[PDB]
């Protein structure tokens, strides 16, 4: 398929990365939904090396991300070897209002960096 969802890639335990599906799902069931899906592909139980980045637009598609998504994002991300990046559709305002501890976690969850970051940090 193309847009809204589709299977972007999905690598495995090492070198994994998925895109933020580009379709308005808002947040209606997105709390337990976010948990179920990402948590069971392993974002907390199994130590996995991966990251997520937004697709292309994902401005109107994604609501209350900081709450559901960013809570479990930064909280579980800082537990293993995972990262996350957006292209700034609102994320800066929303995510920072939720997780203002970005000051100390630093490159935990930022914007447009991962593609080149993993390139350098997995080879040095």
Q: Where are the domains of the chain?
A: 1-124
CA 25 to chain centre: 16
**Contact yes or no for 87/112 (Cβ under 8 A):** yes
Residue 122 contacts by C-beta under 8 Å, 6 or more apart in sequence?
15
Closest CA to 81 of 11, 10, 15, 8: 15
Pairing relation of β-strands 81-86 and 49-54? parallel
Cβ density class 3-22: b for 16+ within 10 Å, e for less: eeeeeeeeeeeeebbbbbbb
Longest Cα pair distance anywhere in the chain, in angstroms? Answer: 42
Q: In this structure, what DSSP letter does residue 120 have?
A: H
Residue 114 contacts by C-beta under 8 Å, 6 or more apart in sequence?
17, 51, 53, 83, 84, 85
Measured at the CA of 121, the angle between CA 73 and CA 44, to 5 degrees, comes to 25
Count the helices and strands in the chain (H runs, E runs).
6, 4
**Contact yes or no for 43/72 (Cβ under 8 A):** yes
Residue for token digits 């907390």?
44
Q: Architecture of 1-124 per CATH?
A: 2-Layer Sandwich (3.30)
The DSSP line for 39-90 is: IHTTSSSS--EEEEEE-S--SSSB-STIIIIIHHHHHHHTTTEEEEEE--SS
Task: Report the distance separating Cα 53 and Cα 34, nearest Å.
Answer: 15
Task: Report the distance separating Cα 17 and Cα 8, nearest Å.
Answer: 9
Cβ density class 33-65: b for 16+ within 10 Å, e for less: ebbeebeeebbbeeebbbbbbbbeebeebbbeb
């Amino acid at each position: 398929m193309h847009d809204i969802d589709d299977y972007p890639q999905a690598k495995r335990v090492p070198g994994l990365v998925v895109y933020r599906y580009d379709a308005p799902l808002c947040f209606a069931n997105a709390e337990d939904f976010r948990r179920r899906a990402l948590t069971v592909v392993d974002q907390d139980p199994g130590q996995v090396e991966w990251f997520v980045l937004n697709a292309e637009s994902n401005v109107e598609v994604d609501l209350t991300a900081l709450d559901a998504l960013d809570q479990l994002r930064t909280e579980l991300l800082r537990r293993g070897i995972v990262f996350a990046m957006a292209r700034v559709k609102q994320d800066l305002r929303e995510s920072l209002r939720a997780a203002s501890l970005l000051d100390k976690i630093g490159e935990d969850h930022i914007f447009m960096t991962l593609p080149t970051a993993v390139q350098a940090f997995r080879r040095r």
